[PDB]
Design an enzyme around this catalytic site. Structure first.
Site, PDB file in Angstrom:
ATOM      1  N   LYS A   1       7.061 -18.944  33.340  1.00 31.15           N
ATOM      2  CA  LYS A   1       8.375 -19.536  33.365  1.00 31.15           C
ATOM      3  C   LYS A   1       8.506 -20.439  32.193  1.00 31.15           C
ATOM      4  O   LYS A   1       9.510 -20.440  31.488  1.00 31.15           O
TER       5      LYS A   1
ATOM      6  N   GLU B   1       6.071 -29.482  38.036  1.00 32.93           N
ATOM      7  CA  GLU B   1       5.463 -28.860  36.897  1.00 32.93           C
ATOM      8  C   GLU B   1       3.985 -29.060  36.934  1.00 32.93           C
ATOM      9  O   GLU B   1       3.512 -30.191  37.004  1.00 32.93           O
ATOM     10  N   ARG B   2       3.221 -27.947  36.785  1.00 31.15           N
ATOM     11  CA  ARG B   2       1.787 -27.957  36.902  1.00 31.15           C
ATOM     12  C   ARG B   2       1.245 -28.760  35.760  1.00 31.15           C
ATOM     13  O   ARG B   2       1.718 -28.655  34.633  1.00 31.15           O
TER      14      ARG B   2
END
Lengths: 187, 507, 470, 469
Positions: free
Chosen positions: D157, D183-184
Site C-alpha cells: 500500500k 502504520e507499521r
C-alpha cells in the site's frame, strides 16, 4: 455521595431509600419500621411468604399494600412511598431484597462491620472472644467502626481456619497447605 | 428482576420522597440518556407522535420512539452542543417544511435553510413531512412524455409524466449524469412556455459530498437551468436523522408543484444512502434490525415515499410529480434487500451495466433488463412508429451475437443481423452533456430502422449522424418543422424522410 | 357495553401498546378504535403482555398519537361489511367505503378472522375451467374451484396476465369475482379501476360481478397484512351465504408474506430463514386453507406471486409453491424471447393435466409437446458450440418443430391491444388440441417459423403463412 | 477543572467514570486520569446518566484500579499547530515523539472540528500530473482533489504512496501532511528517514512536511482519533496559513477498523459485517473536513486496506462516496507482475472528462478502455480454447492488448531497489503521444517483453534492439 455504594439488583431502590431518608435523618426510624413490617410479613404465611411472588393485579397489589399498612400505624412515610413504588413496579420479591440492602447501608451509617470466621466445626467461645478482641485491636477494625463477627460452620473446609472481615482475610487452613505439600511432592 | 426506565436514581429518589413528575413533564422533560446523537428524555407525557422537540441546547429533534419510560428523540443536532439533564420544550408541531414556488433557484438543506445563501426563500406555505398519497380515483392516466434527449432512454424506456422509474446500476459510475441529462433536455420546454409541458426539476442529493453538490450547481448554472431547478440537499456530514428526513420533505416540496396542478420531476439520488441512514437511526433506536441490518420496516418507509408521486385526476388538474429513484447496487447485486424492495415498488427499471461502459456503450444501458412497464403509452407517436421493431432487432442481435463468439457456423442471415445490430448500438451511443431533440432523433432512428445505416461503415457512423443532421437542418428543415409540429409521421413525411435519408446516404 | 378505556403507552412504529382498564383485557384478535383527527385508527389486539397492557398492531398511520390517548374497544375481530351491494365498491382494510361512490350499503358485517373449513366440508371437484389461452389450455388446464398460481418475477406484466384472465373468464362467467390487490401500486390501481369500469364488470348503475379491495403499498405493513383477510371474508360471504361460485383474484401474495415479515420484527419474533416470519408457514396455511371448495360454494383463486430475482428456492415462494393447486411459472427468458405469454412451458406444471381428466388424446399430445421441448433444451448446449452438425435428421426436424411450437404458443392478449397493439385471440380448447395435434403430426411443418409467431389457431397460422407468402 | 470522578468500570478501553459532582463534562470533552504511567487521556462519548459518562480511552488501560481519581481536562483536546509543527512527529495526544522537545506553538486548536459549509467551497479543475503513466492515462490527479487508492497490502500500500510523495511532493511548495493511521512502525521509520534524507524535513534546516504517525501497535481507541488530530494540523495550514497543502492518509481502513472495534464496547448493536452503525456519519465527518474551500486547496490521498479485496464490504463502499478519483489496484494485476499494479478497468476520475483532458486524450483513453475490456471479455474463451481459435480480427486485438498490458509496466523510482530496475518519470504530454502510437500499432511489431517494464515509446524501441541483441 452517601456512604456505601451498593447499587444492587433493585438495590438502586435501596440506595434511593437510604439517601432520601438519610437527609430526612429518619433512617434508623425507617429501618426500624421497615423491619417491623418485614417481620410481620415473614409472620404472614399465606401471601407474602406464599404469595411473596406476584401473579396479582395492580389494583389487587395495591389492596395487598393497604392491608400491609393497616397492620402498622408506625410505618414512617418514606417506606410508605417505597411500598407504593414496589406496588407500582409490581415487585414484591425484591421486598426482602431491599430490606437486606437497606440494612447494609443502614449498618454502614451505624458503622458496624461484619466478618466471618469460617471453620469446619463451631469452636470455643474463648477463641471467639480472643479473636474478636484481636480484630478490634488490629487496624483492620477502625475506630468508630464496630465489629460483628460470626463464626460459621463450613464443614466443606475440613480442618484449617479462615478469618474474614472487611473483604480482607487471613486464611490459615489445612487444605491449602496440604495442597501445596502434595504439589511440591509431585515436583 | 428486570431493568425499568424508572430505575434512574434521580427519578427513583424523587418517587421515594413522594415527589412526582408533577405534569410539567407533560410538555417538558429532562434528558437522562443521551449520546450517539440519540437522546431519551423522561417526561413529555403529552407529545404528538412524530413531533419536533426544541431541545434546550437549541437543537431540534424529531421523536420517533415513544415509550412509557423515555421518549426517544432523534437529534438533528451535534453531540458536543448537547448536554445531559437538559430540559426539552415541545415544538408542538409534527415535522414540517416551508413549501412554495420560491424554492426555484435555491439549494436548501433539509430544514429548508438556503445553504447556497440566496437568502430568504419565498415559501407560500408549510407542509408536513409525510402526506398521504392521493387516491385511486384521484389519479389520471399518464400520456404526457418526459424525455431525456438520449436516444436509448427515449426509444427503449420512454418515461411519462407521473411515473416512477428506477435507475439502478453500479455505484458512482456517473449514475447521476444519466439523470442530469433529463434536466438538461427539460431546458427546451422550460425556456419555452406551455405550463403542462414544463417540468420544474427538483434534484435531491442525499449522502453526497459538498464538492459533488458544488459541481452539480456549477454544471446547472453553466447550462443555465438552475433557474428552473430546486436542489434539496442533505450532504454526507449532515445528521443521519436529517438524511432520513430529507427525501420525505423533498417530496413535500414537489407536492406543492403537483398540487398546484403543475408538472414537475423529482430525482432521488441516492435512496441507497437513505437506507443506510435509516439503518443507523433504527439501530440506535434499538428496534431489532431487518435482514442485511437494514430495519424490518425499511420497505414501508421506501414504499410510502415513492407512492407520493404521480399524475393526478382532471379534478385535481392533472399536475404530475414524476419521480426517478436512483439505487446504487453494491457489486451489482440486485438480490440485496434494498434493491429487491425498490424493484417491486417502481414502475420501471433503467438497468445500467458497468461493463458495457468499458465496452464503449455510453450511455451504458443494459437494455435487456431495462423496462418501462407503462411503456409507449406516453411515447411520442412519431417515435413510437419508428422504434417499433428497434426492440426486435436488438433482441435478435443479442441472441445472435452470443452465438457468434461460441464458434458456431455463421450464415448470411446471421451476418445481416450482425451488421444491422452493430450499427444500431453505435447509433444509440451519445456523449455526456448532449441531449438531442426528438425532431432530430426521429430521422436518425428512421435511417437505422429502414436499414440505410447498414451500408454505411461503422467507423464513420458518428460522422454520418452529425452531417445528416446538418443536412436536414439546411434542407429538410421543413421536414423538421413538421415533425416538431405534428409529432407523427404522415405518409408524406415518411416518404419525404425516406427520400431525405437516401439522399444523404448517397453522401 | 362500556368501551374498555385504554391509554397508549408506547408508540414504537406500528406496534402501539395500550393500557386497558383493569380486570378486562380485549381478547386476542379484537379490534380497538381510537378516534383520531384522521378517522378512527384501528388497532388489532395481537398479544396480551400483562396487567392489562396489550400489544397491538396498527392498521393506519401512527402520526400524532399522544401518549395515554383514550382507546375505545370495539370488542371483537375487525368486522367489515358484506353484502351483494359490496360488489362494485373499493373497500379498504378496515372496511371503509373508499369506493368514493359514498357509503357502502351494509347488509351484514362479518369478522375478518374466521377458522378455515373442516376436512369433512371440503369436497374436491374435478371440472375444467378453460381460458382459451393456448399455453394454459394445453399444458396446464385450470379447474373449477381451483387455486391457480401465477409464479413469476418482477413486473412480468403480472397484473397484465391477471387482467387477461379477468377479460376472459370473469366477463364470461356468471359467478361473482373478488379482486384483491395487496400492495398494488396506485398506478396499477387506477388502471384496474378504470379498466373494469370500462369493461363494465363494474357497471356504474348496473350490477357488478366483481368487488374491489384495492390495497395500496403506502398503507402500513400491518394494514397490508389484513388486506388479504378482508378479501377472504367477502369471498366467504359469496361462497357460503350467497352460495354462488366466486373467482377470487389476489395480487401479489409475496406482498402478503412480506407484510407479515415486516411486522414480525416489531412483534419481537426472532428472524427465521432469509429474515422471514417464523409464523410463515401457519400464516400461509390460514390463507390458503380459507380458500377452498366446500359442500357449499366453490372459489377459484388466482394468486399472483412475486418471486424475488426469480429464486423460487426462496422459502416464501417455495412455501406458496406447495400450497397452490395449479402452478404456472412465467419466466423472464420467455418474455425476452418475445413470447407473450411469458409462461415457461417446461416449468408450468399442473396436476390437473391427466390422461383421464383431459383424456388420452389431450394428454398424449401434451406428452409429445413436453418431450419435444425438453429435447430442444437439451440440444441447446450442443447447438451452442457445435451448431447443427452432430445433429441427426430426426433432431433437425425436432428442432424445427420446437421452434414452430415455441412461436405457436405465442398468442396476443386482448389486454395487450394496448401493450402490444395486436388484436387479442382466444381459441377454444378443443380447437387448440386439434391445432396442436396437426403441427405435431407435421401437417404444417411446411409452414414458416414466423408464420406461427404471435397468432392464434391453425387457421390463423395458415393465414399468416399466406400473408408471408404474399 | 476540579470536576472529578472515579472509575466505575473498566470494560475494555471504554472506561466508565462516575462523576460525583453535579457538574458533568460535556460530550467530546476530555478527561485526564493521572497515572504512574504518566497520564491517560479519555474522551467523553456517552452520558449514561446517574452521573456516569462512558469514555473512550486514548491510551492503554493496563493496570487501572477501579475508583481511581478522574479529573476533567474539559473540551476536545487541543493539539498545537504552527510552523513549529513542521517537521515534527506528534503522538495522538500530541507529544513530539521525534524528540525535538516540547513543540512551542501560538495556537492550540481542538481536535474535533466542524466541516466547512456548503457556502465555503471552491471547485477545482486543475490537473496535477504525477508522471506515472497509468495514472496519467486513466485517472490523472488534480490540485485539491481527493484521490483514493483501494486494495490492501498485497499491492504494497505504502509503495504506491511513496512514489506519489517522491514525485508530487518534491514539486509541491506548500505544506504537506502525512498522517499514517495504523502504520507499521518500521515502514514509518523508513519514511521519516527518507524524508530527512530528501530534505523535506531537515531538523537543523527547514521542514515543509509535518508528520503525524499512529503505529498499529497503538490501542484501537488511539487509532480512532489519530485522523482527527491530523485534520486539525491540516486545517491550520488550509485556513490560518492559507498556503496550499498536500495530505496523505495511510490507512483509512484502519480508521474505520478502529471505530468498528470500539463500537461493540460502546454499546451499539453492530451493523452489517461488523461495522459501527455510525459508520456513515463518522466517514462523513472525516471526509468533509478535508475539502477545498475558498481559503485553501488541499489535495488528499486516502489508502483503503480493502479487507480481502471485498469492495462489497461496507467500509470500502462508503469511501467511494467521498472520492473524486480512485485507482483501485488489483492483486491479480500484481500477480501479472505489473508494478504499478493499478487495475485499468477499475480506475475512474471525474477528471477523465473530454473537456478536461481534451477530446484527443479522451478518444485515446476510450480506445484503451474498449480494447482492454474486449481482452478481459475474451479471457474465458482464451483459456478454454487457444487464441488461434479466435477470430482474425480478435487475435490482432488480443495481441495489441497483450502489448498494452505490458506497456503499462513502468519502472518505479521509489521501488527502484525492490524492482531492481532504474525508475522512470514520463510526462503527461509524452504519455498521450506514446499511447497514440501504440493504438495505431506503429511500433507494434516488436516483442511483447519489449513493452514490459519500460518507460516511454522511445524506450520500448531501444529495448527492442536490446532484446534483439
Amino acid at each position: 455521595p452517601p456512604p456505601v455504594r451498593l447499587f444492587g439488583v433493585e438495590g438502586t431502590y435501596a440506595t434511593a431509600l437510604y439517601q432520601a431518608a438519610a437527609k430526612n435523618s429518619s433512617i434508623d426510624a425507617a429501618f426500624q419500621s421497615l423491619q417491623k413490617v418485614e417481620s410481620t410479613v415473614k409472620k404472614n404465611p399465606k401471601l407474602g411468604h406464599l404469595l411473596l411472588n406476584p401473579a396479582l393485579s395492580l389494583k389487587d397489589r395495591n389492596s395487598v399494600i393497604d392491608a400491609i399498612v393497616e397492620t402498622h400505624k408506625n410505618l414512617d412515610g418514606y417506606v410508605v412511598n417505597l411500598l407504593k413504588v414496589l406496588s407500582e413496579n409490581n415487585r414484591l420479591g425484591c421486598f426482602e431484597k431491599i430490606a437486606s440492602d437497606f440494612g447494609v447501608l443502614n449498618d454502614a451509617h451505624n458503622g458496624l462491620l461484619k466478618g466471618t470466621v469460617t471453620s469446619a466445626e463451631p469452636l470455643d467461645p474463648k477463641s471467639f472472644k480472643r479473636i474478636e478482641k484481636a480484630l478490634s485491636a488490629s487496624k483492620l477494625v477502625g475506630q468508630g467502626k464496630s465489629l460483628k463477627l460470626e463464626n460459621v460452620v463450613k464443614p466443606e473446609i475440613k480442618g484449617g481456619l479462615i478469618v474474614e472481615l472487611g473483604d480482607k482475610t487471613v486464611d490459615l487452613s489445612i487444605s491449602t497447605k496440604i495442597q501445596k505439600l502434595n504439589k511440591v511432592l509431585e515436583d | 428482576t428486570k431493568a425499568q426506565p424508572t430505575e434512574v436514581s434521580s427519578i427513583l429518589e424523587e418517587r421515594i420522597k413522594g415527589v412526582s413528575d408533577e405534569a410539567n413533564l407533560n410538555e417538558t422533560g429532562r434528558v437522562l440518556a443521551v449520546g450517539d446523537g440519540i437522546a431519551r428524555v423522561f417526561g413529555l407525557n403529552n407529545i404528538q407522535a412524530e413531533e419536533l422537540v426544541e431541545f434546550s441546547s437549541g437543537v431540534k429533534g424529531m421523536a420517533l420512539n415513544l415509550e412509557p419510560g423515555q421518549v426517544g428523540i432523534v437529534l438533528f443536532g451535534s453531540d458536543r452542543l448537547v448536554k445531559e439533564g437538559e430540559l426539552v420544550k415541545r415544538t408542538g408541531n409534527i415535522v414540517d417544511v416551508p413549501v412554495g414556488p420560491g424554492l426555484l433557484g435555491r439549494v436548501v438543506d433539509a430544514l429548508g435553510n438556503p445553504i447556497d445563501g440566496k437568502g430568504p426563500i419565498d415559501a407560500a406555505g408549510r407542509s408536513r413531512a409525510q402526506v398521504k398519497a392521493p387516491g385511486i380515483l384521484p389519479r389520471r392516466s399518464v400520456h404526457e412524455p418526459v424525455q431525456t434527449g438520449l436516444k436509448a432512454v427515449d426509444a427503449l424506456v420512454p418515461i411519462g409524466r407521473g411515473q416512477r422509474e428506477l435507475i439502478i446500476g453500479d455505484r458512482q459510475t456517473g449514475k447521476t449524469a444519466v439523470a442530469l441529462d433529463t434536466i438538461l433536455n427539460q431546458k427546451r420546454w422550460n425556456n419555452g412556455s406551455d405550463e403542462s409541458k414544463k417540468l420544474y426539476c427538483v434534484y435531491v442529493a442525499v449522502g453526497q459530498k459538498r464538492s459533488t453538490v458544488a459541481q452539480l450547481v456549477q454544471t446547472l448554472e453553466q447550462h443555465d437551468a438552475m433557474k428552473y431547478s430546486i436542489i434539496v440537499a442533505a450532504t454526507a456530514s449532515e445528521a443521519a436523522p436529517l438524511q432520513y428526513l430529507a427525501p420525505f420533505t423533498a417530496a413535500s416540496i414537489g407536492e406543492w408543484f403537483r398540487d398546484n396542478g403543475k408538472h414537475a420531476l423529482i430525482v432521488y439520488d441516492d435512496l441507497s444512502k437513505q437506507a443506510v441512514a435509516y439503518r443507523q437511526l433504527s439501530l440506535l433506536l434499538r428496534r431489532p434490525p431487518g435482514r442485511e441490518a437494514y430495519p424490518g420496516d425499511v420497505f414501508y418507509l421506501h414504499s410510502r415515499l415513492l407512492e407520493r408521486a404521480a399524475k393526478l385526476s382532471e379534478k385535481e388538474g392533472s399536475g404530475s410529480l414524476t419521480a426517478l429513484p436512483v439505487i446504487e447496487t453494491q457489486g451489482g447485486d440486485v438480490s440485496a434487500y434494498i434493491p429487491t424492495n425498490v424493484i417491486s415498488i417502481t414502475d420501471g427499471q433503467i438497468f445500467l451495466e458497468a461493463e458495457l461502459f468499458y465496452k464503449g456503450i455510453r450511455p451504458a444501458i443494459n437494455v435487456g433488463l431495462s423496462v418501462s412497464r407503462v411503456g409507449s403509452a406516453a411515447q411520442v407517436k412519431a417515435l413510437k412508429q419508428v422504434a417499433g421493431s428497434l426492440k426486435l432487432f436488438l433482441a435478435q442481435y443479442r441472441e445472435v451475437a452470443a452465438f457468434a463468439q461460441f464458434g458456431s457456423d455463421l450464415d448470411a442471415s446471421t451476418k445481416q443481423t450482425l451488421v444491422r445490430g452493430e450499427r444500431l448500438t453505435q447509433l444509440l451511443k451519445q456523449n455526456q452533456y448532449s441531449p438531442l431533440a426528438t425532431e432530430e432523433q426521429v430521422p436518425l432512428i428512421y435511417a437505422g430502422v429502414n436499414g440505410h445505416l447498414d451500408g454505411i461503415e461503422l467507423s464513420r457512423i458518428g460522422e454520418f449522424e452529425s452531417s445528416f443532421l446538418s443536412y436536414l437542418k439546411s434542407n429538410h428543415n421543413e421536414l423538421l418543422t413538421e415533425i416538431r409540429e405534428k409529432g407523427e409521421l404522415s405518409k408524406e413525411l415518411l416518404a419525404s424522410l425516406k427520400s431525405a435519408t437516401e439522399s444523404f446516404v448517397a453522401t | 357495553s362500556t368501551p374498555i378505556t385504554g391509554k397508549v403507552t408506547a408508540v414504537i412504529g406500528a406496534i402501539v401498546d395500550v393500557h386497558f382498564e383493569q380486570s378486562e383485557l380485549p381478547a386476542i384478535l379484537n379490534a380497538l378504535e381510537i378516534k383520531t383527527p384522521q378517522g378512527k385508527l384501528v388497532l388489532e389486539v395481537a398479544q396480551h403482555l400483562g396487567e392489562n397492557t396489550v400489544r397491538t398492531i396498527a392498521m393506519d398511520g401512527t402520526e400524532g398519537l399522544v401518549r395515554g390517548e383514550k382507546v375505545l374497544d370495539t370488542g371483537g375481530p375487525i368486522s367489515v361489511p358484506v353484502g351483494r351491494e359490496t360488489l362494485g365498491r373499493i373497500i379498504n382494510v378496515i372496511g371503509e367505503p373508499i369506493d368514493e361512490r359514498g357509503p357502502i350499503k351494509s347488509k351484514l358485517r362479518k369478522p375478518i378472522h374466521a377458522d378455515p373449513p373442516s376436512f369433512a366440508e371440503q369436497s374436491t371437484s374435478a371440472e375444467i375451467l378453460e381460458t382459451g389461452i393456448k399455453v394454459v389450455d394445453l399444458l396446464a388446464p385450470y379447474a373449477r374451484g381451483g387455486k391457480i398460481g401465477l409464479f413469476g418475477g418482477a413486473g412480468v406484466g403480472k397484473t397484465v396476465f391477471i387482467q387477461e384472465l379477468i377479460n376472459n373468464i370473469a366477463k364470461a362467467h356468471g359467478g361473482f369475482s373478488v379482486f384483491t390487490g395487496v400492495g398494488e401500486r396506485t398506478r396499477e390501481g387506477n388502471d384496474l379501476y378504470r379498466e373494469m369500469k370500462e369493461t363494465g364488470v363494474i357497471n356504474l348503475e348496473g350490477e357488478s360481478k366483481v368487488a374491489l379491495v384495492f390495497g395500496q403499498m403506502n398503507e402500513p405493513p400491518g394494514a397490508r397484512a389484513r388486506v388479504a383477510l378482508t378479501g377472504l371474508t367477502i369471498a366467504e360471504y359469496f361462497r357460503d351465504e350467497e352460495g354462488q361460485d366466486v373467482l377470487l383474484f389476489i395480487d401479489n401474495i409475496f406482498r402478503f408474506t412480506q407484510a407479515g415479515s415486516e411486522v414480525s420484527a416489531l412483534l419481537g419474533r426472532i428472524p427465521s430463514a432469509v429474515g422471514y416470519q417464523p409464523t410463515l408457514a401457519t400464516d400461509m396455511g390460514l390463507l390458503q386453507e380459507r380458500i377452498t371448495t366446500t359442500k357449499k360454494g366453490s372459489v377459484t383463486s388466482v394468486q399472483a406471486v412475486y418471486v424475488p430475482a426469480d429464486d423460487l428456492t426462496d422459502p416464501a415462494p417455495a412455501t406458496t409453491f406447495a400450497h397452490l393447486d395449479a402452478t404456472t411459472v412465467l419466466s423472464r427468458g420467455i418474455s425476452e424471447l418475445g413470447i407473450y405469454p411469458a409462461v415457461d412451458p417446461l416449468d408450468s406444471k399442473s396436476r390437473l393435466l391427466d390422461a383421464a381428466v383431459v383424456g388420452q388424446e389431450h394428454y398424449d399430445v401434451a406428452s409429445k409437446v413436453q418431450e419435444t421441448l425438453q429435447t430442444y433444451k437439451s440440444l441447446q448446449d450442443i447447438i451452442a458450440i457445435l451448431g447443427m452438425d452432430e445433429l441427426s435428421e430426426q433432431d433437425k426436424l425436432t428442432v424445427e418443430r420446437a421452434r414452430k411450437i415455441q412461436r405457436f404458443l405465442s398468442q396476443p392478449f386482448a389486454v395487450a391491444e394496448v401493450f402490444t397493439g395486436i388484436p387479442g385471440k382466444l381459441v377454444r380448447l378443443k380447437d387448440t388440441v386439434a391445432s396442436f395435434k396437426a403441427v405435431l403430426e407435421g401437417k404444417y411443418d411446411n409452414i414458416p417459423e414466423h408464420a406461427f409467431y404471435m397468432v392464434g389457431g391453425i387457421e390463423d397460422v395458415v393465414a399468416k403463412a399466406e400473408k408471408l407468402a404474399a
